[PDB]
Design a binder for this molecule. Structure first.
Ligand SMILES: O=C(N[C@H](C(=O)Nc1cnccc1-c1ccc(C(F)(F)F)cc1)c1cccc(C(F)(F)F)c1)c1cnccc1-c1ccc(C(F)(F)F)cc1
Lengths: 118, 120
């Protein structure tokens, strides 16, 4: 047993990360700004074990991966995501299980915001 | 305060409730026993606000709602709140599957289904 967080009330907490799904479709840049306004960033995938809840995510959602590195400038670690071509573009949609579909950054999509606690 | 729980280590926490999805298909009675083995119960729906994450649940899963011939009641013996679930009959049964958004499908208790456990 343990506690999870800290997270704001409207976020799912899993292994001390906070996740929130946004159903209003936006391009990658507008989604990034939305997460920032919530003291967060777009989903960053850094651990298959500590983020194994992402195996259960359905549909396709902006994550913070750009052409590959994350918003915060950090690199994509190997053996975390299978990146699959789909549409010509420089952004990627998260899909289960641990897949990234390359997508046009200007195409509206739903998105996942995430806050790390440490 | 800003922490959620307590909950078992690898469960999801939301508004101080803990949830775990089980992909193994079991009948209602086996699912109930599985949650109890983990010091939990099958999903109980009490608030569309506190449990609005249930709007995002895909597919159908056992919850702790049973018919006692009476009315629909939860495992713990408490009553189903009105205006919470829309109950839809499509099989002869005394048990119910949760489906989004805030629906309960009457289902044969013996039919294997995936299930959701919950702890508070
Ligand atoms: O992924 C979407 N739904 C699955 C789903 O239920 N998947 C299953 C598939 N097959 C079978 C079962 C599930 C499943 C069933 C019950 C639970 C339970 F234990 F919770 F009870 C969890 C999973 C999902 C995944 C993680 C957490 C939750 C939640 F906790 F909210 F219930 C739900 C989904 C679908 N449409 C739009 C948006 C989403 C979505 C996107 C991001 C996020 C996140 F996490 F990033 F915020 C959450 C939801």
């Amino acid at each position: 047993e343990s506690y999870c967080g800290p997270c704001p009330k409207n976020w799912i907490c899993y292994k001390n990360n906070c996740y929130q799904f946004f159903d209003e479709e936006k391009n990658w840049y507008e989604s990034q700004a939305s997460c920032m306004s919530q003291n967060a960033s777009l989903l960053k995938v850094y651990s298959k074990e500590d983020q194994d809840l992402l195996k259960l995510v359905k549909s396709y959602h902006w994550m913070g991966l750009v052409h590959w590195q994350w918003e915060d400038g950090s690199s994509l670690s190997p053996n975390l995501l299978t990146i699959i071509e789909m549409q010509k573009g420089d952004c990627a949609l998260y899909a289960s299980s641990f897949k990234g579909y390359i997508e046009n950054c200007s195409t509206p999509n739903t998105y996942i915001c995430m806050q790390r606690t440490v």
